[PDB]
Assembly symmetry: C4
Homo-oligomer: 192 residues x 4
């Protein structure tokens, strides 16, 4: 599974502001999710944003909306998976889904399962995906891996999409990754 | 393997009183196993409970018993695996087994092996499964995933079973997960 | 792969005296390797022991020799893999090899590759296998896992062989695991 | 996948001067990469070196060039993968690639994928591979192994190539591994 700007879509899973206080490393996950949003906008990659029950949970964080392409749709849902009817038009035109968003073990995991069933490759951006619980997040990644999803990072994805430093949009995406993505406790303390 | 209340069974492995002093995170595992017992009762999911040598090892912890459906069967065994004659008819009806309890590397692991041989999918609830030794538990999970068992968490499992906030039993199961399941030392301390 | 006393052999890899100063958790690995030596003797499981360059690295630690049955051969070698001509006949009569010993990333790993090629299932006893370096040991397990070897522990293996407390040899092998196996730093320290 | 000096090539990717201050464990990785370069020269294993945009990033670190086998090609590139036309003839002669170098999640990962696509076995030397970010490096290895790359270590590789202590070049390669390769924090802390 080799991602490029013409065979991939970005899915933004339920990144709503009323979650903030519960989600682990939420500020970092917003920062890094915005990088992927910008990258998708620069690389003309179709972006889908969902919102879980926005009547109670509010809408997508403003900063993320501000990076979205002019015609990016935002679909509301009560089903955990992002694979709802109005997303299928986008899904027919791509072979890869890049996934960011929250409750890795719920909406991100169920989405991942649905996309894999449909024969799509799923690229989970671990530094842009989190849960209320560290354990739920930790094992969400394992379940996604077991099922065949690629566990990747923001900088790996962004540079993987352009393939080389000669890419027409390399300088634009390089600006987004000038500083390393903020740490989200993914790397264990080292044994001496 | 997509779990729902109609294609799954809950298996409760040997969570007995005399194990309290020896099993790592025993109190936590009891709390979290009870959540899964409750979810199964709510969603009409058949529950099987076993006990190993109940005369020596005690009976199932009261907190767990108190959550069981009116006619949930409790079977005693000497075999490590829960796949014993009295459980065979339950297994014939289901495609998935949700697994909690102890002897992670013994009874839980051997149960897992036996179920996979029978063609069942196994969903090991890591935050509800433990051992006397941290090392035994850690590599039990690795052995299960190697064998093809799914390493999942209680909250992932509960919400996975309902699939969305419009499920008629969503509000009932939502009570079970109001607070995150207690930590059982599954996530490594991270470095900067 | 389901291990039992009639389908398995124990392979003891190069647990020699001069490694004592240059192996992480050497005393712990000897203690635990002796447990598997004991279990194999009790259960009539054929045991094969090797020695690499005994003139320059010393002989098998006395504790381990004392646990071997009256027969049990000790083969010297210069090749890293324990798969030398004298071991070929034992391998033909079994489907599983339980593996303990040192140079996880060298002698243990190469033995593992050779055995899997011969069509044998390999069960690596992680709490009885080590290296001079933590990194070499850590990724040795990952390499073994990748090739299809099972990463197991001493108690999991010993109890896995008997399958229940009604087994005629249960109480005899239970003696070997009354106390948990020594801790060889294999579990990540966890975040609060 | 059984590496020997006659079926293998060493790929050194983008270990250049301007990366020195922007790569975790750069000095360690250079020391360890030099061990593999020396081993390849000793064992007459074909070595290939790439440099990414050497106009801006400078050239291969002097110490590494000092050890290179006599007729070693060094190719420049802007594409992240080492799999460029000039490397094709080398790759048609081998079944195994040993990989060291930097942007674990960029050059090394992209090279790894390209190599695996060509039906080559990839041996990733984890103690000679790193990134600017720990998280990027950590998941680089995960993505590599998901794709089928072997995560190995320098000492495992050197000794794996010779097969035994009676190899005509064993004493020569043994000098390179007299001390353990410098630690790069790859093993999870288990005890403070």
């Amino acid at each position: 599974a080799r991602i490029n700007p013409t065979n991939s879509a970005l899915f933004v899973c339920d990144l709503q502001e009323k979650f903030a206080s519960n989600i682990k490393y939420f500020p970092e996950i917003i920062t890094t999710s915005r990088r992927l949003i910008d990258a998708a906008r620069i690389l003309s990659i179709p972006t889908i944003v969902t919102e879980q029950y926005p009547k109670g949970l509010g809408h997508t964080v403003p900063t993320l909306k501000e990076g979205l392409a002019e015609n990016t749709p935002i679909f509301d849902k009560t089903k955990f998976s992002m694979c709802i009817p109005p997303t299928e038009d986008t899904l027919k035109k791509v072979q890869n889904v890049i996934l960011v968003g929250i409750e890795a073990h719920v909406c991100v995991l169920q989405t991942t399962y649905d996309l894999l069933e449909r024969g799509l490759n799923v690229h989970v951006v671990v530094d842009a995906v989190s849960s209320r619980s560290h354990t739920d997040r930790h094992f969400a990644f394992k379940q996604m891996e077991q099922a065949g999803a690629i566990l990747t990072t923001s900088e790996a994805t962004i540079l993987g999409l352009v393939g080389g430093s000669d890419h027409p949009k390399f300088k634009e995406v390089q600006k987004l990754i000038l500083t390393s993505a903020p740490d989200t406790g993914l790397v264990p303390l080292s044994k001496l």
